[PDB]
Amino acid sequence: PFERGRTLAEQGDAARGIVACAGCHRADGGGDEALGAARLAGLEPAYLATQIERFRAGQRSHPVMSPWAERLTPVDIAAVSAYYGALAPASNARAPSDVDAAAGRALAETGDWPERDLPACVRCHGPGGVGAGAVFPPLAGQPYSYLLAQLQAWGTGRRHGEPMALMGAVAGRLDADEQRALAAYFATRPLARAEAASRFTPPSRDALPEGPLGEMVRLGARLFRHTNTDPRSAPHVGNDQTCAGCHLDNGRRADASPMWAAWVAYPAYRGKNQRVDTMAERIQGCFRYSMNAQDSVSGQVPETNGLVLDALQSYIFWLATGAPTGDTAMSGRGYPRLQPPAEGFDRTRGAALYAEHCALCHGAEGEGLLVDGEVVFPPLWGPRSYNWGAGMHRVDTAAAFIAANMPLLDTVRLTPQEAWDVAAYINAHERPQDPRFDGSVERTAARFHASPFDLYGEPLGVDGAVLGQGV
Amino acid sequence: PFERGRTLAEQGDAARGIVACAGCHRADGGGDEALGAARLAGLEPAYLATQIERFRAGQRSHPVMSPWAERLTPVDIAAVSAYYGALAPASNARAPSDVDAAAGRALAETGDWPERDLPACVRCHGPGGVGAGAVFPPLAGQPYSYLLAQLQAWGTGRRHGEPMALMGAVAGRLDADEQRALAAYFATRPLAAASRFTPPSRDALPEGPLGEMVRLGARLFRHTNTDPRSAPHVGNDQTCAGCHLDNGRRADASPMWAAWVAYPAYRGKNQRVDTMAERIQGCFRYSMNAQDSVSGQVPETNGLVLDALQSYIFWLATGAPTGDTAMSGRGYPRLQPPAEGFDRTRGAALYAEHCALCHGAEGEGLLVDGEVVFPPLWGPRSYNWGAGMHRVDTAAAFIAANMPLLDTVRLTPQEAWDVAAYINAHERPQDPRFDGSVERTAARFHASPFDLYGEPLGVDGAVLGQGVA
Ligand code: HEC
Ligand code: HEC
Ligand code: HEC
Ligand code: HEC
Ligand code: HEC
Ligand code: HEC
Ligand code: HEC
Ligand code: HEC
Ligand SMILES: [Cl-]
Ligand SMILES: [Cl-]
Ligand SMILES: [Cl-]
Ligand SMILES: [Cl-]
Ligand SMILES: [Cl-]
Ligand SMILES: [Cl-]
Ligand SMILES: [Cl-]
Ligand SMILES: [Cl-]
Ligand SMILES: [Cl-]
Ligand SMILES: [Cl-]
Ligand SMILES: [Cl-]
């Protein structure tokens, strides 16, 4: 299959009237700026084949490429897909000198949640745009002309068919200048409104504090976003999660437990441990439960006067600039609470919904996706998810998160009841044991999980075994 | 001695024309409400004698008592003072039923700094008004009639002569209703503004368990050295409230509300970003000298003491905007450095004039039943050599704005510089950063023009920074 692919890429098949693919995509698979021919080298074979079939189906049209896509046989398609997927990545990109690639960095890496509900390109396209599996292709090293053409296509409807209409929604929220900057930005990578709602605005990401405090704010922002991979916090993280995955826009997003609403609210009484909690104590709670620190290398939450807690507290403090001390009800805090359903919650409808609207990113078995060790799509159950003591294991809490925040891009927004059903499906799977586990599921259940929205201990596992055994 | 005093108290002296003192002050020395006769039992003999001489001088006048004071000889005065000071405390006080003693609790125990720059009565008269040495007499158990007459006398000029005219300034700031309430309050105790942030009133505590923590932090702040929870981490005779006046509420006396919103922060003193908890542990390390405490350690950072103090500081800061590092009132007002330097000899004069009355001739301060009334300013029970207050600029900024306690006197900046240099040119507990050499420790941690550690400005010009061993 690599042999048919090679001969089609390098020489074509004169008999069948098929030109060499390298005539336009070049010998290294690196693309061509002048023709707007894509990079093919190293792309996921399933993606290449899907794109050839998109051309054939009319979801994509290009006067140059569509005819070569129609002349392929199915066996030819699979061969060239495997050939280009086996190549070493390569790029023959060259961005224009008249376009400021730095102007795209903001959207590429942090998006625009506040004005456009728009995630960063890298939130789906992987770190630095190297791709995130077969669904989500790389942008890094694709020629400028090719990237800009696709964005122009989706923004006008001359390209469609992708899952959940995701790129139509993205392209629809960009202006022409941003399209050029984003294309130049990703073409030059290496291959390896609150006022009108009366809501708080955190400081711009350019406005860091001066001097050493600013360096710590930056570190706290990176520990928040890369909790599981940074050498300082990783030894205290026992799963494949980051703070940013449940606190969207790196802690800035109203209705996704923004950190600015939390800073001014602690110290506070918390019924979960029957105790008043500082911000540090709270952050250590998150390491204990959402980051599963017991299964970390260190086995422990981070030291309370160490650099990790100091940076995280500095970052959170900074996001809260201007907010009124002691306001425990800032608009945007936490997740919007839902009315509990009169008629319960149905994990079977939930599994249908999850397959429809979530599995694309989070996986058919909740396994999530990691790229070069970074969390792209968090695992939602199993041994690399949050553990049974984490707040997100509750049905009401996760339902409120989901209804307001998932799917990531708001082409779809679930009803409360749909959110309740999907939340009950997700949180009825095993995940790491409660750190408060006593040895007995019933006992641990009666002391720490005695709520109608907590399925720990209920007989909903495999062949009706009780939930709450771990992995 | 005590024997002449007794027979003067119990029988008088027929010959010299002296009636028995117990006829009005009673046998137990507890006073008498009907006569307005004072409690004498347990008062400091120096105070009793000073008062008798006040009558003789005309600084005090009362037609009932003045004649018995003029009939005493110097030997007699010393004798009766000795007898009444050796007696067990006692009181025959009985306050009116038509006067609400709780209306005095506020002024008695927390003052009115914000509107009248007026300290609590116990700030000078000791815990629960039981007295603070010879200068400061007890109010507890004094008859209502007696206390109110004295407060009325000072308010009209029928009593004077007390040091720095302190009680004339105090009584001048009370209305008649408050005078009755305070007298009722102390007779019934046992014998053992605009453009600036406003913290919450002391009645407006939070609901539930946070409120109990805020309460606790307020008392650790006020009683740091005696409370069982914080005392094991305090190695000197200090409290937070002593340098952070009005228990952390007073603008220009490093209020806590301006600090809550300023941390985390880079601090040049340790080259690092410090949380509020880390900042507070530093205060234990230096201002409270935790090294010479029982535990030898500062309080644990997620322990009860730190949690309570941070809850209290948080509460005081209600409403303040996060991240405002320049709230008006923060810290102490910075002084322009003197082109004339600072003169410890000038300073020692001023200290004897305006400070020793309370802080002691030798800076020793005063304690009553373990509570800090007047902090030691040097010696083994003061802040140590790493504490901010040991710096001349910092202490001068505190003094110029806040001492003497009551604003009948306010030093000029140059005076504040001079007194600060005198105070901070005395020995005190060693820097916790001491590395074995005074010269090295001075070069690494005290190389500033406003720091005298290491310089030869001590007793007979000895190098400062040797500690108290
Ligand atoms: C942030 C503004 C961006 C930019 C500049 C791009 N994307 Fe996406 N993208 C997504 C999916 C599912 C696809 C595959 C579509 C299909 O199957 O046909 C894409 C593809 C692209 C391309 C085309 C790449 C190619 O090889 O042709 C380009 C140029 C592109 N994207 C730019 C999904 C998402 C998201 C999921 C919610 C988010 C966010 C983005 N993309 C963000 C961006
Ligand atoms: C020039 C005449 C070309 C020849 C010969 C081939 N391709 Fe091509 N291809 C070309 C252009 C100009 C483009 C961009 C089209 C657009 O919509 O802008 C393409 C695109 C592809 C893609 C999609 C890439 C992606 O990132 O999604 C694939 C998978 C692709 N081409 C495969 C391909 C194969 C297998 C060829 C030989 C059979 C081939 N192309 C020839 C221009 C030209
Ligand atoms: C999902 C698995 C999460 C991950 C990973 C992290 N957090 Fe979290 N956090 C989460 C929820 C569902 C809630 C609210 C409900 C509850 O009772 O737990 C929180 C709350 C916080 C807070 C307090 C917010 C407030 O009171 O307004 C803080 C300060 C917080 N979380 C910090 C935090 C950090 C620093 C994380 C990475 C170490 C982190 N969280 C991960 C869900 C999840
Ligand atoms: C890709 C386009 C996604 C789809 C479709 C859905 N989710 Fe998602 N989710 C996605 C990302 C990138 C993240 C992390 C956010 C970040 O900034 O890094 C998430 C996060 C969650 C979480 C938080 C739990 C955790 O352990 O991190 C939950 C509970 C979650 N998502 C649920 C969820 C459901 C139920 C969906 C279908 C309705 C769904 N997601 C769609 C990316 C995508
Ligand atoms: C009734 C005729 C009395 C006799 C006999 C003595 N004292 Fe007296 N004393 C009396 C009154 C009504 C007052 C209050 C005067 C005022 O200005 O309000 C006093 C006051 C004193 C004081 C001052 C106490 C203080 O707390 O400052 C002292 C020290 C005192 N009296 C001592 C004293 C002695 C030693 C006596 C025997 C020689 C004596 N008093 C007799 C009423 C009467
Ligand atoms: C320090 C600035 C003081 C504050 C604050 C208060 N008082 Fe005071 N008081 C002070 C001194 C130095 C003296 C001694 C007077 C003397 O002649 O030496 C006093 C005395 C009193 C007395 C007289 C007691 C007696 O036995 O005669 C009373 C009744 C008194 N003080 C009341 C009082 C009240 C109610 C205060 C709070 C409002 C208060 N004092 C504060 C110094 C200081
Ligand atoms: C004098 C001997 C002090 C004692 C006892 C305590 N503190 Fe202190 N503190 C003191 C000084 C001179 C300063 C610096 C002020 C300046 O203008 O330079 C401080 C500072 C603090 C701060 C930071 C305030 C801010 O940044 O605005 C806090 C939070 C603080 N101090 C708390 C504190 C506590 C809780 C104490 C009892 C445990 C305490 N201090 C004692 C002087 C003295
Ligand atoms: C009694 C009337 C006082 C006079 C006169 C002076 N001071 Fe004072 N001082 C007094 C009290 C009760 C306190 C503690 C306040 C509290 O609310 O508990 C203080 C505090 C100081 C401090 C803080 C230092 C510390 O180690 O705690 C300093 C540096 C200080 N005072 C200096 C000072 C000087 C220089 C004075 C003469 C100008 C002076 N004080 C007069 C009570 C009294
Ligand atoms: Cl994002
Ligand atoms: Cl990939
Ligand atoms: Cl058009
Ligand atoms: Cl569109
Ligand atoms: Cl940043
Ligand atoms: Cl695991
Ligand atoms: Cl485990
Ligand atoms: Cl009288
Ligand atoms: Cl006071
Ligand atoms: Cl209080
Ligand atoms: Cl108080």
UniProtKB/TrEMBL annotation, chain B:
It comes from Marichromatium purpuratum 984. The keyword Heme applies. Heme c 1 binds at C21, C24, H25, Y47, R60, M65, Y146, Q150. Keywords: Heme, Iron, Metal-binding, Signal. Heme c 4 binds at C240, C243, H244, Y263, R279, R330, Y332. GO terms for molecular function: electron transfer activity; heme binding; metal ion binding. Heme c 2 binds at Y47, Q51, R54, C121, C124, H125, Y146, R159, M167. The keyword Signal applies. This is Cytochrome C. Heme c 3 binds at R222, Q238, C355, C358, H359, M403. Residues 7-88, 99-190, 342-427 form the Cytochrome c domain.
